[PDB]
Amino acid sequence: TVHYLKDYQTPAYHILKTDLHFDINEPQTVVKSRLTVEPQRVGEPLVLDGSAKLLSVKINGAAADYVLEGETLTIAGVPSERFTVEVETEILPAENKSLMGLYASGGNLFTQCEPEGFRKITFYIDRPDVMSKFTTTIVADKKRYPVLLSNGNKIDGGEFSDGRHWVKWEDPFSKPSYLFALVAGDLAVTEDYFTTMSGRNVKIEFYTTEADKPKVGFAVESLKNAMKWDETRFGLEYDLDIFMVVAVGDFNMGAMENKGLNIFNTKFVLADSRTATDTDFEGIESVVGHEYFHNWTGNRVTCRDWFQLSLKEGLTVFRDQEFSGDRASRAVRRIENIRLLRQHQFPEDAGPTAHPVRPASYEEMNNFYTMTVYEKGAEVVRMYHTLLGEEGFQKGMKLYFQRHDGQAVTCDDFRAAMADANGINLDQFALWYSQAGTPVLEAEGRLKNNIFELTVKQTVPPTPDMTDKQPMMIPVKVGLLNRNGEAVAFDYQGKRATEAVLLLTEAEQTFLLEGVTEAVVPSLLRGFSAPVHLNYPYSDDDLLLLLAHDSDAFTRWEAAQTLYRRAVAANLATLSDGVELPKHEKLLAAVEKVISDDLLDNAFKALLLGVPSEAELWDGAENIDPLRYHQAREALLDTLAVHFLPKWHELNRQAAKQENQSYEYSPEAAGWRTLRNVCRAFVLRADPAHIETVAEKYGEMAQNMTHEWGILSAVNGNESDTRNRLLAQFADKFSDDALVMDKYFALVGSSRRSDTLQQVRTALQHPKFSLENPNKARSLIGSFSRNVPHFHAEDGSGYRFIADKVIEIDRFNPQVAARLVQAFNLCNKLEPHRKNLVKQALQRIRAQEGLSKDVGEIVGKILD
């Protein structure tokens, strides 16, 4: 069964009220529902999704005639007007390792319903265009389960003689089933509040383990920032007098926006300076923000169907990105977002699983929680902002909510509102949702008479879903610099400005920027103005100029990225010829000017010193030997490390001095640490023996996790025995901290040392490792899967190991397995010996009896 967007039809039934009652016992939990049903297409059979053990079903209090087949329950004869359905189900939550539905974690009970988990709790119409008002009663042993939560307001509760107690939660806002949540357990509470702009108090409650409670203060503060910001930037206000957040250690995703009761992977909720990196702190802020932002972009307005997922996720990622940029370091954070997009989304769009931001079809929707839908999604939203300016963007938002509050809508609807609110036509803009693949811009510039003539071509390649790709609406932001690097004005569309947005809408256009009276070098796609590859024929000297002098952060960074890229290409040539490495003399010149320029933002400096990844370097190539790209990259870094070794120590020391013992998270302090960690990595490349020194004062350097992580990362590839001793000490010191143990496993899994495969196989049996825990599994196995020299070992060991673990995880958690199997996405682009080995492994996965739909769908795309 494949689901197609073209077949969407409205539901035959609506569900008006959903009354749930949960009776929690050992080992089983019994769910009794009462649904109020409203026929839309009278006489149609009533069709309910469900997979929990069914004990009884009734229509108006009476035993119903029905049939159960697969995961559907069908009742043929049903009233021609309002009726009730009552379903009784039974669940064994300790047996649930998929972590979808109602499941156990650390002795407590949690739910995860998006996208189709609710049907694992009860039989229901489990689709997001069906919206109902829920009231949830929960009964459980008081001592084992003192804390009992669901969405909305708590309106009643009591005690029973036998030790049980009960609560009743009423959520007055209609909602689709994926936004339901229940939590039951012995949990510590952290209390606070925010007062909305119209003077209402909102009680905030974070729930964690008793031991984890001291690590939740920064999450709380981030939430209060996020609430404030949604008021001031979007005019959005919270709509209940309670907001609850619950941390859980077994969780497949990052976090979940259930209405008034968000549930969060601990890793996006818990931090202190001793156990979390500054980056961990920044993740907490974006993710807490993100989930709070969903309250409007997702909850108040939800999705008509899952094909529309990006209507909530692209827009909400844009929101969280804007929140973080407004808090601090906007340009640096923009680049970070771009780099992530190019490093993970682009390879997606170039590979077997490429899909549109709004898929036309899917077998299993859990496979479409992807970088394309989320990050490419946010870029598309961002382009509306680019075309319309902030004020015009907020007008779209207003009309969006005016029209669609309380509805389940589509990406077309969102487009229409940005279009109608500003009286502009965005018909062509729809292709950003329906056409997959990364557009490629070919660009030429000519200065003749006093005009700079900029010719621009676009193609979008075929992807596996679609061959025909029509030209798109693509904004390209541009500047010019003279030989001395200063801004240059030009005349475009009437105005004389120093920058413009050129709007490419055709296969090829020329843009005339008139009034130029200097030799100029153009700066293109400023701010990464659209998610595309641009080729322009720049000299190295042109790049050196852009880098030293250009006013836009991205374009300066892209220029360094481009030099790094050219240097790696040069390295591949010589190593391939068996000759000495190139001298990269201009590059080294440029790095030196970056290292030494003290007017550069510290974090930005750090990004300028980052070399593109192996996946970026093999973009577009065929017959890839990943190790040869890896050896080329490694050679560059070794050259940079050795060549500038003493400047790496000095930068380090300047950064230490600037940090000034301010060990707590702050954007300012974090910037210095980011730079200090880049130096540590280069130093330990050039001089692995410096590890013994580092060890001698480890205590003294380990003033926070940012420092321990950065030192541990820098040595992680060192073949010294000391590397192993330090990891073992790290495991020992932080053995009770599960999020820190995830770091240990990530280090084990990512190491470039020659023995990583066996060290990984020992880690599987470490007393703190659980294959059944998604954080752990990703940490060790996911990391190994991305470890280029080891995953792509010529002997096939890496591919065989990963394929076994795909097979093994998929028996309890198909989601984690389907994410893992994507490590093989490069299959058809590898050189023949590795391709054969990859194809064998994918055949072996395919051959497993009982293989999930999740993994099957992915292996099909790679193999067939």
Ligand SMILES: CC(C)C[C@@H](N)P(=O)(O)O
């Ligand atoms: C699948 C679900 C738990 C995650 C999303 N709704 P996000 O808010 O993490 O995007």
Ligand SMILES: [Zn+2]
């Ligand atoms: Zn989300």
